[PDB]
């Protein structure tokens, strides 16, 4: 894990070029690259606290996209202005195989719109709950993609802060696309915001300490555990009871977890920051070189040359069968501009 050989130098070089490209877009973000009547709205794919994600068809190309719609007034009431500006500025600047691609963004009097590649296979959440749990090789396949994605994001000074199966979509090749950058943030120091999802929060978030990218590696431990067990390592009907479990320093593993898997998770689900994998001198390479990943060909994963555990069923273009049904609400655009100054840079 400490060895710095030719493979490590190639990673370094790749990330250096990736950062040069990211920073150009970070400093000069794209804006106002479509408008609402460029799209036919088809069906709601999911909802959130600010609005909905809708399947749409782009009229001029016939391509299908997922359009995230945020109500500006609701964003303001939830004190999510800066987070939403982070989300869009980061998403329009990144480029990685396992990150959803933002194709267009724009705003109108009422709403913000982010139009992303449509990922038709549905949420990992749906497949995981239905099948119960994933085998260790299948969990490994997905985990490897997150490891590489966090290596990429963290090298750009980005923290992701909301890893969970609900935010991981499965594409038509069986690979992951991360979505929901609502809490993603570019930061070189520590930061302090209480955000995330209860089951996935690191102890230092719960305890109101300054924290850094190590919270993402804790959340990877939660994700791997949930994929392989079928339930997360800390759960209870009341969030306060979840928090008490997280900070206790105790974790238990299913009988079927391999010895290697338990070892990796003890090192990711480490309350002590000075011991947590991903946060040590060797950084991500303590994870990438762990015995549980010994079979993982990191380059083959990046190149999408590894056979996936399953290919989602696909009935045709624009099919939504891998998604739940949601109540549809009509998109209303007010005749008066709302919150223009707050969202001027979007």
């Amino acid at each position: 894990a400490a060895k710095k050989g030719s493979e490590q130098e190639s990673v370094k070089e790749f990330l250096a070029k990736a950062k040069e490209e990211f920073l150009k877009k970070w400093e000069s973000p794209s804006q106002n690259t479509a408008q609402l009547d460029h799209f036919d709205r088809i069906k709601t794919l999911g909802t959130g606290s600010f609005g909905r994600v809708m399947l749409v068809k782009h009229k001029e190309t016939g391509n299908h996209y997922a359009m995230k719609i945020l109500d500006k007034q609701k964003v303001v009431k939830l004190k999510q202005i800066e987070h939403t500006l982070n989300e869009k500025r980061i998403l329009q600047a990144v480029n990685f195989p396992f990150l959803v691609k933002l194709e267009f963004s724009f705003k109108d009097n009422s709403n913000l719109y982010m139009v992303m590649e449509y990922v038709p296979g549905g949420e990992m959440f749906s497949h995981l709950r239905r099948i119960g749990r994933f085998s260790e090789p299948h969990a490994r396949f997905y985990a490897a993609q997150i490891v590489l994605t966090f290596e990429y994001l963290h090298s750009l000074d980005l923290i992701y802060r909301d890893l969970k199966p609900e935010n991981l979509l499965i594409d038509q090749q069986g690979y992951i696309q991360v979505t929901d950058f609502g809490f993603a943030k570019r930061v070189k120091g520590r930061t302090w915001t209480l955000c995330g999802t209860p089951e996935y929060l690191a102890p230092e978030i719960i305890l109101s300490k300054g924290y850094n990218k190590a919270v993402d590696w804790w959340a990877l431990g939660v994700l791997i555990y949930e994929m392989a067990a079928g339930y997360p390592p800390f759960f209870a009907d009341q969030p306060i009871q979840i928090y008490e479990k997280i900070v206790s320093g105790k974790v238990r593993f299913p009988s079927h977890f391999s010895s290697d898997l338990k070892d990796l998770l003890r090192n990711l689900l480490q309350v002590d920051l000075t011991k947590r994998f991903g946060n040590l001198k060797n950084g991500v390479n303590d994870i990438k070189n762990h015995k549980w990943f010994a079979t993982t060909d990191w380059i083959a994963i990046y190149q999408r040359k590894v056979e996936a555990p399953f290919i989602p069923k696909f009935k045709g273009p624009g099919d939504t069968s891998n998604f739940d049904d949601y109540e549809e609400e009509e998109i209303r655009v007010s005749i008066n501009e709302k919150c223009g100054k707050e969202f001027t840079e979007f």
Partner: peptide, 19 residues
């Protein structure tokens, strides 16, 4: 079983973020 306890819990659906 812990599985059975999870499936009977109120936390098996999509989980909202906090802030």
């Amino acid at each position: 079983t812990t599985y059975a306890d999870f499936i009977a819990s109120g936390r098996t659906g999509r989980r909202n973020a906090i802030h």
